[PDB]
């Protein structure tokens, strides 16, 4: 948690349905966005922060929250945007000898700024006489080691926490979600919607040969009459369905 890893996610589609088998018993309580509508959403910036904290310390991962993890290990900004995911890992991060490999910062001169990492191993001076490299009384190592106790409740068990931070510009988007598709129906009055281009008309085979970069097709009336299907590279004519005045 003190040396928390930071990861960049971009230029990809984010699928959130996978995060049930990989991370069972997960908690998706988060801030800044509705969890449900994340599937049809676009993110321009994504940060991933992952570490392991104790069960009693999972509540400390929240904006405006103070504590041992918050002040000395990982501080969240008040205006934090993005969501956090935490699930139990007793089957993975618990050893019969003891999970002594996970350390956290315990003594620190001042509370950490949001989204900051401290890897210093200097001996902390909690008194008046300088430590001078001695770890005796009034001179404690700033980092202590987790001693996970699976025998007790979940508060003394290793919790794997992954912190995701976004910005939600949804204009220069590089991370988005799937939208699926339906099979093509032709030669009838059809409500179509191609990449957000909703319209009604009759979809017929098109003889036009517009260039590979060239996507749409416009007319004199400055309306889209020709379209190329994103699923299959084919040319379609969009014609308004037969109409006319009745007398």
């Amino acid at each position: 948690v003190y040396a928390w890893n930071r990861k960049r996610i971009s230029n990809c589609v984010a699928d959130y349905s996978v995060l049930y088998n990989l991370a069972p018993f997960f908690t998706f309580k988060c801030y800044g966005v509705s969890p449900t509508k994340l599937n049809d959403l676009c993110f321009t910036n994504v940060y991933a922060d992952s570490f392991v904290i104790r069960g009693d310390e999972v509540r400390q991962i929240a904006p405006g929250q103070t504590g041992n993890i918050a002040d000395y290990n990982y501080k969240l900004p008040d205006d934090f945007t993005g969501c956090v995911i935490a699930w139990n890992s007793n089957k993975l991060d618990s050893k019969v000898s003891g999970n002594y490999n996970y350390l956290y910062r315990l003594f620190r001169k001042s509370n950490l700024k949001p989204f900051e990492r401290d890897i210093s191993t200097e001996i902390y001076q909690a008194g008046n006489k300088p430590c001078n490299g001695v770890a005796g009384f009034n001179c404690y190592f700033p980092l202590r080691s987790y001693s996970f106790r699976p025998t007790y409740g979940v508060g003394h068990q290793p919790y794997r926490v992954v912190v995701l931070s976004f910005e939600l510009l949804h204009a220069p988007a590089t991370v988005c979600g799937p939208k699926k598709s339906t099979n093509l129906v032709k030669n009838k009055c059809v409500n179509f919607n191609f990449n957000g281009l909703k319209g009604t008309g009759v979809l017929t085979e098109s003889n036009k040969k517009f260039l590979p970069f060239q996507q749409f097709g416009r007319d004199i009336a400055d309306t889209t009459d020709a379209v190329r299907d994103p699923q299959t590279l084919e040319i379609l004519d969009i014609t308004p369905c037969s109409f006319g005045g009745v007398s």
Partner: antibody
Amino acid sequence: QSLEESGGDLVKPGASLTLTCTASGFSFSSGYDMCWVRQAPGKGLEWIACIGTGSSGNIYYASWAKGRFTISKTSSTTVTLQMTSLTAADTATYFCARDDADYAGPDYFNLWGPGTLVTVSS
Amino acid sequence: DIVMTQTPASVSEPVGGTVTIKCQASESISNWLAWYQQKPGQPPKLLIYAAFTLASGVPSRFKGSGSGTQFTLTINGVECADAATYYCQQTYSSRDVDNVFGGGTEVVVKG
């Protein structure tokens, strides 16, 4: 505990050899991991391949040791490593690393065996 | 995936002198790193596991500093008997790795 090696001898190029790591005083428990390493006579250590001593062997291999080598467990206190198509550069000193944590891979190695020397000549 | 280098290759300090060996990783390995030292004709032994915790039977002079990508081992004192090679292990992600162990760094103590 000891992890004395076996099966080390002069071998012709393009051949096969069977190196055996035998444990003494303990058995290959599931909660603790074992790995295999070797040391060239002139340069530092390297990792090639090894398997876990658990119920489900989480066998793991190195990039330069992708398919030439083969490691399997034959008994609770006997593990063997098989390599084929041995070349001139394969000569080294082979050690039987003993891990301390079963995180699906070589973690901190607290105990090593005395090791064996495998050389190639024609 | 992770490529680790150990520098300097050769070091030489007086018996009362201090020498430091730094171990650098291609990407962050957090706290997962170990230090190993072998004498000629002898397999190496674990010295500094988790990059800070001292081993058993080892003098306190052996220590560890740094975290994430750069890890440094500082030698406070030699006694002409610690002249050997030091290696660092990534012990972080070994799915497809050519070698978890780092480069070789022998220590020469001029007594």
